[PDB]
Write a protein that binds this ligand. Structure first.
Ligand SMILES: Nc1ncnc2c1ncn2[C@@H]1O[C@H](COP(=O)(O)OP(=O)(O)O)[C@@H](O)[C@H]1O
Ligand SMILES: [Mg+2]
Lengths: 503, 264, 50, 69, 51, 48, 261
């Protein structure tokens, strides 16, 4: 009470000062033509007298198009618009961790104010060719399919593209839930601070998302940034730049950070609304020209930093939905063109039975084997080549073109590895169990074993290896490579377990 | 039940404000009374279309296919007010027209984004004769999760969807060649799939004028038991005509027995 | 306060009759599930601070 | 220092008005009762003092037997 | 070979013994976790009511 | 040979029917693409 | 090597004109240096994207698919500046993006109109598994004429293209019934063409980390002899995987001996 009194009466300066303003013309639909600001700078946070920010774009000789950060009822024609004096900025700290933060800095979750220290400009320039260095660290997701065919690098951007309702947000949350075991460990290089920018979603999906992360105890890497549907179109526009600025703070301090841009097409459609209300000419699908420049800034804010610049990395993974699987639409071609890694879900495998539904050969990671551990590189290259062989031989021998022993070998190993890559929702596993199970799948011992029985093989095999083989998995994950004694030991343990599986 | 009607005879300004009317009635009954309300809003594409008509008159630049630029945020505010909160519960069933059966149209696409349980009441499955013609593949729900609905319901549901996806690939092959190109595995999948796809259909109480059957209210455990038996394959002798407009699985066994007896 | 003696589970298969093979399967799978249930639990949470 | 010292004075006058929450009205307590009712929903029907521990169950694993080996 | 199977007859009964011991220790740890849960519930409920 | 001639006659007929249906949906998709591209160009030249 | 690099996140005036900066530097190394110079422009589709973005904002009516009306003229200027002249010799390899494998986009079509010897890098042959998934059935050459390269090289090239083009319609014959009824010679040419298409793959030295194989260098005469020896009927018995990731024909012999014994 009394502390509230004294903070209210000491905190506000009430330091009046002469200040540039300008009256307001047409306040249309969140856009306001403001006459008068002859010294406003382009893309600047400006302030409507009812207490609400707007961002000044589209500086014209008549007037400035300020697009508002919120509701439109609270603005009339003829009121003042005060210049704040600086570009729109995001308050970033490490005390911002584990707290849902509305798109500017405003933590709307009911857990007090944010204890920020480091304000940061949000429209910053990304690093050049010298401050960047290449991908080195293996960004693991816990998904067997991602970490064994399209592995991520700490230092990298990699799409999650699909159609609606396929498992893309679920892949992003598997990626989040994996990294708990690296945060609570010892190495700072393993530890994770991630930023989940939910663009244009609904508030109950973000609420149940925070429920899943709190129940999975995720709230020390995580920073959830919600610009939901009821938020204004510039809050949905500006939210992934805010998450990028928080990720750039962690990166330039030297902590391995990532950002999941969930539903990045909602940023594209909110910026389409903004351009068509500020009367810019429409381009293709009524999206304007610089949507590629928009996502190109947003996604080239991330690669590994130099060893003299802290060594912190950023992993941008944006989630994008197509419509009817049309990859040739404007926003998917732009966002595939800017990124390099991309994970393709076609959906017919989701209804066919593999989970997560990576339908695959469209998906590629350009950094490839450089972003794997040494064991997963030693095991899972022949798996990718075998899956390529399997897909093409099944595609022409759909009807039984020619079946020698080689073709039934290819279909057998392909179907068995297809049921290897199935994995339940919200259950990420570490890298050493993945090396163990893809060793049990690729290096023999599963080729003639009745493909419906692969899932019980998975369950009993993980139970076996977590039961009496924890120190050997410690040897595998800490030694890096899977050594030759560990190789023959995995051979012996999978043979013993094949006996105990036909027991 | 309270009623609000802004029917299709109304000018576009009226139809752009009916969902707001019934929604603030139901939002009163949520907040300042604490009740567990139902909100049956038919047909929210009329709201979005009235917005597009007004905006074409409002002088805003046309967006994609012919709508307004404010399709995401006007429907955004209207759908975010339709929410279950701490103060009370809304269960809101809303019918959402699609224009010319396009699910890639912007208003149905953003409405897929704003929902917790979709149901794609298709037409082609009614060309096949199944009513409602609910496309069940493109219909999902957020609540289907083995940590919620149990393991039995989840395994039966994902098996049904697996059999129907395999049937879609095999009906491509069947439509070209015919059913005399399939193996025993493929034909058992096709037969189980047609049995399941007929057994999804049931007669409703309100649509008893069109069909002949009375209204069947199927409980949950009988749905799981019936689809679990058809999926496990205990009914490799009943005809697929015996699963059409049935309800519980004992009615399917009885319809097959009555079919055999009327053929006797 | 546990006293555990792990065996290699091969003589467990060599030791059973035909009469109780299904019950031995049930006890084996239940013991596997119960060992995993032991392994999922850490020993105790800390005391509630005051 | 014109306005905020008058606001300070009114902070004193609302602060001096102790002995219950000021000028509340019935809907104050109604909102208290609805929030308290949802809070009653989030645990059940327990007590604010002298917590119970558990209901003592008994794990009963059936004795395996055999006729002859 | 039947002599060898005679020698191994102290494994099955050991499996029953440590099965019962593990079940009882898991049950006591569930007692511990459970009373921790309910006193946690009481204190968090008082804190949320005060908030 | 008799039943194979019958099966290939019926498969040619079913394939010809599906060619007819897919040609109709190809034509309506073509017209929709032309009208969409035209509305985008006209909207650009009008909002200019 | 002189490097001119404009990043992909710069405004479109900096992403269109940076190609012209590379042209200016490589023109000076060709105009009055008096030197054979080669210029690697990767990836001239950002040029056309940048032009379409400014033409959206400059106040010009959108053309066909949504690019600028000045596409063909602007790219005609910046692709006719880059050609060899009588003063110096300059050779320009251009990595040129197409959007989602759509070759009928007008900017790749006009880019085809400016080239001399293109190379299509499809995706479908990498769904097969051949890398890079090069289409020579859509690739061109001004250089390929029987007087320029030879008659032997030209005839084995047209034989490879003839047997790969026939393999498509023959494969669509396969796709309904299978390998049962084609012929003796028809199944023979299907297997021969499939063997050639697997022999087109070649391990790059810079890509020894994607596949693991070390990667080799193949001269021209060895390629002519290898494809003429596969068309000549010498290797009708070796499997398709013996020719997959090889260099010369000796490497295919060694891999066949490794797979067999
Ligand atoms: N590994 C998995 N196992 C089972 N179900 C999964 C898995 N991954 C995703 N899903 C399913 O995906 C759905 C969630 O999709 P989501 O990621 O929300 O897509 P979108 O964000 O496009 O709506 C859930 O219903 C869930 O059942
Ligand atoms: Mg999503």
């Amino acid at each position: 009470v009394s502390s509230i009194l004294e903070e209210r009466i000491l905190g506000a300066d009430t330091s009046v000062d002469l200040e540039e303003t300008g009256r307001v013309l047409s306040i249309g639909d969140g856009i306001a033509r403001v006459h008068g600001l002859r010294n406003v700078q382009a893309e600047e946070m400006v302030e409507f007298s009812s207490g609400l920010k707007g961002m000044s774009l589209n500086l014209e000789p008549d007037n400035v198009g300020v697009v508002v950060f919120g509701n439109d009822k609270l603005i009339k024609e003829g009121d003042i618009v005060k210049r704040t004096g600086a570009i729109v900025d995001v308050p970033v700290g490490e005390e911002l961790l584990g707290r849902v933060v509305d798109a500017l800095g405003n933590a709307i979750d009911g857990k007090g104010p944010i204890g920020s220290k480091a304000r940061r400009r949000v429209g910053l320039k990304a690093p050049g060719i010298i401050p960047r260095i290449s991908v080195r660290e293996p960004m693991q997701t816990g998904i067997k399919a991602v970490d064994s065919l399209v592995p991520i690098g700490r230092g990298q951007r990699e799409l999650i593209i699909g159609d609606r309702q396929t498992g893309k947000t679920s892949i992003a949350i598997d990626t989040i839930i994996n990294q708990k075991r690296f945060n609570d460990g010892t190495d700072e290089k393993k530890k994770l601070y991630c930023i989940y920018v939910a663009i244009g979603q609904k508030r109950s999906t973000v609420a149940q998302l925070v429920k899943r992360l709190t129940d999975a105890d995720a709230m020390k890497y995580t920073i959830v940034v919600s610009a939901t549907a009821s938020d204004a179109a510039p809050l949905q526009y500006l939210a992934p730049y805010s998450g990028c600025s928080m990720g750039e703070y962690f990166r330039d301090n030297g902590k391995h950070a990532l950002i999941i841009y969930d539903d990045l097409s909602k940023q594209a459609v909110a910026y389409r609304q903004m351009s068509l209300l500020l009367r810019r000419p429409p381009g293709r699908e009524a999206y304007p020209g610089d949507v590629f420049y928009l996502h190109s800034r947003l996604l080239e804010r991330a690669a590994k930093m130099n060893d003299a610049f802290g060594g912190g990395s950023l992993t941008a993974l944006p989630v994008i939905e197509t419509q009817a699987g049309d990859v040739s639409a404007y926003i998917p071609t732009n966002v595939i063109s800017i990124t390099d890694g991309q994970i393709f879900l076609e959906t017919e495998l989701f209804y066919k039975g593999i989970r997560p539904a990576i339908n695959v050969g469209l998906s590629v990671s350009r950094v490839g084997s450089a972003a794997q551990t040494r064991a997963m590189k030693q095991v899972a290259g022949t798996m990718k080549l075998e899956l390529a062989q399997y897909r093409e031989v099944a595609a022409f021998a759909q009807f039984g073109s020619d079946l020698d022993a080689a073709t039934q070998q290819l279909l057998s190993r392909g179907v068995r590895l297809t049921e290897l890559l199935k994995q339940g929702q919200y259950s990420p596993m570490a890298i050493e169990e993945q090396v163990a199970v893809i060793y049990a799948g690729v290096r023999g011992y599963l080729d003639k074993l009745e493909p419906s029985k692969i899932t019980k093989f998975e369950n009993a095999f993980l139970s076996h290896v977590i039961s009496q083989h924890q120190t050997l998995l410690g040897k595998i994950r800490t030694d890096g490579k899977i050594s030759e004694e560990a190789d023959a030991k995995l051979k012996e343990i999978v043979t013993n377990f094949l006996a105990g599986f036909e027991a | 039940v309270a009623l609000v009607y802004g029917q299709m005879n109304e000018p576009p300004g009226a139809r752009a404000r009916v969902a707001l009317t019934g929604l603030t009635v139901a939002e009163y009954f949520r907040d300042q009374e604490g009740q567990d309300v139902l909100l049956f809003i038919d047909n929210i594409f009329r709201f979005t279309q009235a917005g597009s008509e007004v905006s074409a008159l409002l002088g805003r630049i046309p967006s994609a296919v012919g709508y307004q630029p404010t399709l995401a945020t006007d429907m955004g505010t209207m759908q975010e007010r339709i929410t279950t909160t701490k103060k009370g519960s809304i269960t809101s069933v809303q019918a959402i027209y699609v224009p010319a059966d396009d699910l890639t149209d912007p208003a149905p696409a953003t409405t897929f984004a704003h929902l917790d349980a979709t149901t794609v009441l298709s037409r082609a499955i009614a060309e096949l004769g199944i009513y409602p013609a609910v496309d069940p593949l493109d219909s999902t729900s957020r609540i289907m999760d083995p940590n919620i609905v149990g393991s039995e319901h989840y395994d039966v549901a994902r098996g049904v969807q697996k059999i129907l996806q395999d049937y879609k690939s095999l009906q491509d092959i069947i439509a070209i060649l015919g059913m005399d190109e399939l193996s025993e595995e493929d034909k058992l999948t096709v037969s189980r799939a047609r049995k399941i796809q007929r057994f999804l259909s049931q007669p409703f109480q309100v649509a008893e004028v069109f069909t002949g059957h009375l209204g069947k209210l199927v409980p949950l455990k009988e749905t799981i038991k019936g689809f679990q038996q058809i999926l496990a394959g205990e009914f490799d002798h009943l005809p697929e005509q015996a699963f059409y407009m049935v309800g519980p699985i004992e009615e399917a066994v009885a319809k097959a027995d009555k079919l055999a007896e009327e053929h006797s | 306060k546990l006293a555990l003696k792990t065996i290699d589970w091969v003589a467990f298969g060599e030791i059973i009759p035909r009469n109780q093979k299904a019950v031995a399967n049930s006890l084996k799978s239940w013991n596997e599930t119960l060992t995993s249930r032991l392994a999922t639990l850490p020993e105790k949470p800390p005391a509630i601070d005051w | 220092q014109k306005l905020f010292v008058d606001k300070i004075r009114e902070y004193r006058t609302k602060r001096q008005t102790s002995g219950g929450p000021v000028d509340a009205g019935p809907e104050y307590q109604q909102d208290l009762d609805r929030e308290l009712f949802k809070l009653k929903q989030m645990y059940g029907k327990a007590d604010m003092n002298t917590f119970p521990n558990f209901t003592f169950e008994d794990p009963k694993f059936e004795v395996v037997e055999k006729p002859q080996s | 070979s039947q002599q060898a199977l005679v020698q191994k007859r102290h494994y099955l009964f050991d499996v029953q013994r440590n099965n019962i011991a593990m079940a009882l220790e898991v049950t006591y740890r569930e007692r511990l976790h459970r009373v921790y849960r309910e006193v946690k519930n009481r204190l968090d409920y008082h804190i949320s009511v005060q908030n | 040979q008799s039943a194979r001639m019958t099966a290939m006659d019926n498969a040619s007929k079913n394939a010809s029917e599906m060619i007819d249906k897919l040609t109709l949906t190809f034509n309506r998709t073509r017209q929709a693409v032309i009208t969409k591209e035209l509305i985008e160009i006209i909207s650009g030249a009008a909002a200019l």
